[PDB]
Symmetry: D2
Subunit: 249 residues, 4 copies
Amino acid sequence: EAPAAVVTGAAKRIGRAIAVKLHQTGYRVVIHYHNSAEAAVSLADELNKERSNTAVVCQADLTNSNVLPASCEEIINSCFRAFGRCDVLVNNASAFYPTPLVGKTVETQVAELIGTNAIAPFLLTMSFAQRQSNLSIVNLCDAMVDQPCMAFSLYNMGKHALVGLTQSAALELAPYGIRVNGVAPGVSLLPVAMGEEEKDKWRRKVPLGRREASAEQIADAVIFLVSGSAQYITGSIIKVDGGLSLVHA
Amino acid sequence: EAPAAVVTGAAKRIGRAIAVKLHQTGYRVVIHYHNSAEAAVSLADELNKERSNTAVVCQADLTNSNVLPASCEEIINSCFRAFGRCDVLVNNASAFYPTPLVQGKTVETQVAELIGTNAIAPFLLTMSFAQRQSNLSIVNLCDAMVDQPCMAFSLYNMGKHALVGLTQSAALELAPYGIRVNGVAPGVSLLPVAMGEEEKDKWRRKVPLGRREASAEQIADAVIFLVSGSAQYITGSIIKVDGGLSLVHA
Amino acid sequence: EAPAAVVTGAAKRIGRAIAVKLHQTGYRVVIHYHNSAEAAVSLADELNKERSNTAVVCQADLTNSNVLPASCEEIINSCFRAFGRCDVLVNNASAFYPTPLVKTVETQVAELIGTNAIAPFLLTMSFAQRQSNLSIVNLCDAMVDQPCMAFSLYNMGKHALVGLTQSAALELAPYGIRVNGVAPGVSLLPVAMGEEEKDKWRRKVPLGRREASAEQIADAVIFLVSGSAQYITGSIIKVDGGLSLVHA
Amino acid sequence: EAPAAVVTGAAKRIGRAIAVKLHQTGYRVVIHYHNSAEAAVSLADELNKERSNTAVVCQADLTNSNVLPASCEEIINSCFRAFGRCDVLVNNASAFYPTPLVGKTVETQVAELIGTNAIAPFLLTMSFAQRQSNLSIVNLCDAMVDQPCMAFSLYNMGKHALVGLTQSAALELAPYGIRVNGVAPGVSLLPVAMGEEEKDKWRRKVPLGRREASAEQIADAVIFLVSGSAQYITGSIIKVDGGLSLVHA
Ligand SMILES: NC(=O)c1ccc[n+]([C@@H]2O[C@H](COP(=O)([O-])OP(=O)(O)OC[C@H]3O[C@@H](n4cnc5c(N)ncnc54)[C@H](OP(=O)(O)O)[C@@H]3O)[C@@H](O)[C@H]2O)c1
Ligand SMILES: NC(=O)c1ccc[n+]([C@@H]2O[C@H](COP(=O)([O-])OP(=O)(O)OC[C@H]3O[C@@H](n4cnc5c(N)ncnc54)[C@H](OP(=O)(O)O)[C@@H]3O)[C@@H](O)[C@H]2O)c1
Ligand SMILES: NC(=O)c1ccc[n+]([C@@H]2O[C@H](COP(=O)([O-])OP(=O)(O)OC[C@H]3O[C@@H](n4cnc5c(N)ncnc54)[C@H](OP(=O)(O)O)[C@@H]3O)[C@@H](O)[C@H]2O)c1
Ligand SMILES: NC(=O)c1ccc[n+]([C@@H]2O[C@H](COP(=O)([O-])OP(=O)(O)OC[C@H]3O[C@@H](n4cnc5c(N)ncnc54)[C@H](OP(=O)(O)O)[C@@H]3O)[C@@H](O)[C@H]2O)c1
Ligand SMILES: CS(=O)(=O)c1ccc2nc(N)sc2c1
Ligand SMILES: CS(=O)(=O)c1ccc2nc(N)sc2c1
Ligand SMILES: CS(=O)(=O)c1ccc2nc(N)sc2c1
Ligand SMILES: CS(=O)(=O)c1ccc2nc(N)sc2c1
């Protein structure tokens, strides 16, 4: 009957809004989370109140390790066990912090930034395909991949690797009827780790309305890509950045 | 109170699917046409017998010339005259034919039709649409294969590349005015009617997603998204609708 | 003998520096010019003092018109007439000014799309028809995907030039003609453009502790023409000190 | 004295030709190798015969692991130990093999394809910069990165990451006068394994002369980017693919 979606990093911000809107469209949802157990459970409760047994939570650290393949396998399995099926994977979870070229060890930075942003999406993608009729994956990419922030080399590397994943998996999974696409926010919901006037510095850069994307605006692009309106769309990355990537220095 | 859209080359194929779909969505439409007089009127009638006073036609030759600005200005004017408003512009019209570099039209006619229809008319139409002024947006029909061009199509590929520049330049410039500019990029959709079935199946075979061409309705779907309220933060984006064709290596 | 190069808009700045540097490598040069007769001739004198009968000038308006194809064909003719061969085409001439969306528009079109894209397409056609290390180098723009505001016709023309670079590289490859581009960022800024505006640009350039220079451009063209680039076609080299990498 | 350069994977094929041609230009070279011990030693013999004291070898495995930072630090150190300086880093070493999405473990595959192709280049770059004239880094990328081979997702993801590193490190290292650029082969020396019939299928696709690049042709591009003729060039990736990436399906 109803289709089923996995959303990684679904407890807060963008992943939350994606999970909410998938749910409003008639998806059952696996809300993946890492540290945000309260917000994840609270979201599952709200959604289950909307419609019974349509939302489960699943905890997994998506850092790269010897166990990441098992964790990703488990995330996919939990969808099939809760719901009988897995139609949609949304790779949203993301680590994001500076790694200057010139405080964790470098190898922890690699495991986190490359782990969450690229390897976990690869492993989730393999598990999703292996366990397989409007089947699709949506990766959360970055509209500013080709004009990186200074001292974010590892973050930028993982986001570029994700673009490669989207294109590679689109090609290889097409014969199986699995579409693979991305959504590339520019400035959306801003990190809490920064002062509220730096917030205004970015908002001023945005040609369209001089404001950041709501999480819902990102979720709208995701909804379109999983829908029947995108049945011939694969390997495409839709920028949702109000024209920010187009602005020169 | 119903919004209105201009669609160029709207009589047949993809532009028709776009007008039909924008109409089913509640838009009043200007069906622009060049040579397809019968097909244009036929479509405007069928649309008008759904909701009356919703579909007008507008004839224009979108070849580059010293009257092209006036014709583009007139397409836009058609929309305000019939409907009081211009909410959407879909640049769909396009000439497509080989122009070999090492070699029955003069080169300057080729420049005029391939760069005229594919780039200059969209720039002039864009200028008039912006000057004439809400969810305002423009959608340019681009080409997914623009960076892997067919042999001998340099002028056509040039026009489509120009159209990407326009898409990005105008998104940037018109953002302050609340006009979004985005594009939709087909790979293989409806093959040229001149094309033999044997040739058609060569193209079908290339496409990773189902070994078939996009339907026109599938192209139109992406245009509907881009103009909708679900795309209110998207400007300067070009969405490929090519079932993965642009990703296949030689 | 000595190979021969056409360089359009060779009289001043970057096309001059490209012309001198190809000459220093042993090329014979057609210095094309439009309004720059005195500068063009002064260049050819300088190069002819160095080796006689190695530099000719040529006048053409590269604005798009019914006579553009004739003018372009005559540019390639001048190189065969004077030197018995044409080995290298450098598409450097370029018009540059704003065309806000909100001089007639069709003159804007004829200049911005004509000189920047259509003349390069016609010259490319004439070059190819009239044929070994043969190559064309198109002067492209590194900021092509981050355009300046109100520069739509300019930006359209430089995108069209990227499509030409790619389409011509593919189609001419079976003839041993390579087609490539060099994309400056800010090099020598418009001599009419103000002074505080020019220091503002240098300040954003990552490799900016250096002067951007016309010779740095020419170096990249010299590379692409050379036997060190015999396998390179359809490539566009940015020479912009990292400027295209900097976000807003 | 003469400036110096580290070339990774320099024992054979493309890395060898880069090493020869940098030596020809007057560089002192560190020939990094993993398994190819005979080849590496023999190349340093030939270069030292030409000009004594100009060529050392350095063995390291460039697989990602918690010791990869020390190995990368060691390759850099070894150039300072032999020559007192390190002017040029060429990231050439690379694993390359299919990883279908539908006898190595997946974590070894990630370690080799993402380790060698991206993480080791990032650590080498970090070590190179920390230890610090015309300083520059050249990464070996892939002209086919947006038209990947089917079932090469992990490889393609690593090469995509390498593009991000190139751009990210050009921007960040620029104030220190270090330029970072890439050279992107299409078809060059075909894998030793692969059959002669497979070799001609690939040769037939190349618009420019229906042939693969010689290793020397790739090296020429490296030479250009390290020289004084490329001093305003940073963040650029030069395709050396005879037009291959331009060819549609
Ligand atoms: N927000 C923007 O402006 C913007 C701009 C460009 C791109 N994006 C992209 O859009 C996506 C979502 O944006 P966002 O701002 O909502 O992301 P975010 O808040 O920075 O992070 C999203 C979630 O990812 C999960 N995560 C982080 N580290 C993890 C680890 N080691 N293992 C497992 N999960 C982990 C976290 O879950 P828990 O809280 O459960 O620990 C976190 O809440 C990301 O892929 C991001 O890169 C966002
Ligand atoms: N078909 C595909 O597979 C495909 C692939 C890639 C991109 N696209 C793009 O998608 C869009 C729609 O595709 P399509 O195949 O439906 O286009 P098409 O059939 O080739 O042409 C669409 C319409 O353009 C009009 N047109 C042509 N030259 C004109 C001129 N000088 N002045 C005014 N109008 C002119 C024609 O209208 P009249 O009939 O009134 O003369 C024609 O019916 C195009 O922009 C195309 O470049 C299509
Ligand atoms: N300088 C930069 O910052 C920069 C940045 C990005 C890209 N570029 C590209 O690099 C190239 C050369 O740079 P540049 O600044 O030296 O060039 P430029 O000074 O802008 O002009 C190049 C020459 O082209 C000729 N030209 C202009 N309009 C013409 C027309 N309508 N007909 C015929 N010839 C015409 C002119 O020759 P006459 O003097 O004979 O009239 C002109 O001096 C250009 O293609 C440019 O787009 C430059
Ligand atoms: N060949 C092509 O047609 C082509 C096409 C596109 C891109 N490229 C790129 O160009 C560069 C060189 O090409 P190539 O064909 O010469 O590469 P290659 O022969 O496949 O490999 C170069 C060297 O990398 C080293 N290497 C591999 N795995 C390693 C590990 N785990 N640790 C340390 N070193 C390791 C090997 O050294 P040992 O032999 O010492 O074990 C190997 O000889 C590569 O970056 C490649 O991706 C090549
Ligand atoms: C504040 S931002 O627009 O630079 C940005 C950019 C990317 C990003 N990824 C995350 N997981 S949060 C985040 C925030
Ligand atoms: C090569 S194709 O047949 O998919 C193709 C590609 C572009 C194109 N543009 C038109 N106006 S019709 C058309 C057809
Ligand atoms: C914006 S710029 O000043 O770097 C620039 C950009 C492009 C350009 N083209 C010319 N012919 S002059 C010129 C100047
Ligand atoms: C033969 S190929 O052009 O598919 C190819 C492509 C990439 C590659 N990378 C290596 N390290 S060897 C190698 C061979």
